[PDB]
């Protein structure tokens, strides 16, 4: 966001940037003692529907791209027969944390194609969030500006 004067600017919510700001403090201790998702009373993300006005009853948790990461492609054998295991799926990706590129042609992507998805993180972060993968994994600076409903 920086544009010359007399342009219609959509500066985001207070709202959102203090999503972010507190998306970045909570993906930091992933990496700081390996010892997180709590899940319990933890990882606060502030929820904002449409006009980026504070809704009211604002909730913790997981947000609504984690839980069904965990659940639907957790699941198909890697997590439903053996280990649903939080604790686990959270150190599942230690593996990947590391030198984490599998070259398999099956993802969350349909049939996945197969370097390309520059400019993906817009129009497919409205639906689901895979570039970004590993950019959770890096120091990254922003996800996508949307929070729509979901709960438990």
């Known amino acids: 966001t920086r544009s010359a004067i007399g342009k ?9 940037l ?14 700081s003692n390996s010892s997180m998702l709590p899940t319990l009373s933890d ?3 502030p929820q904002c529907s449409t006009d980026g006005q504070w809704r009211q009853v604002q909730c913790n948790g997981p947000p609504e791209q984690v839980f069904e990461l965990y659940q639907r492609w957790e699941a198909q054998n890697k997590g ?9 799926v959270k150190i599942m990706s230690y593996r990947e944390a590391a030198s984490g590129n599998f070259s398999l042609f099956i993802q969350s992507l349909y049939e996945a194609g197969q370097a390309a998805l520059e400019g993906k993180r817009p129009q497919p972060r409205e639906n689901i969030l895979i570039l970004n993968g590993q950019l959770s994994q890096y120091p990254g600076s922003y996800s996508d500006f949307s929070t729509p409903l979901a709960h438990f």
């Open 18 to 31: 203090q999503s972010e700001q507190a998306f970045l403090r909570t993906v930091q201790a992933l990496l």
């Open 43 to 45: 990882t606060y993300i």
């Open 80 to 88: 439903q027969d053996l280990t649903p295991a939080k604790l686990l």
């Open 8 to 16: 219609p600017k959509k500066c985001p919510t207070p709202c959102q």
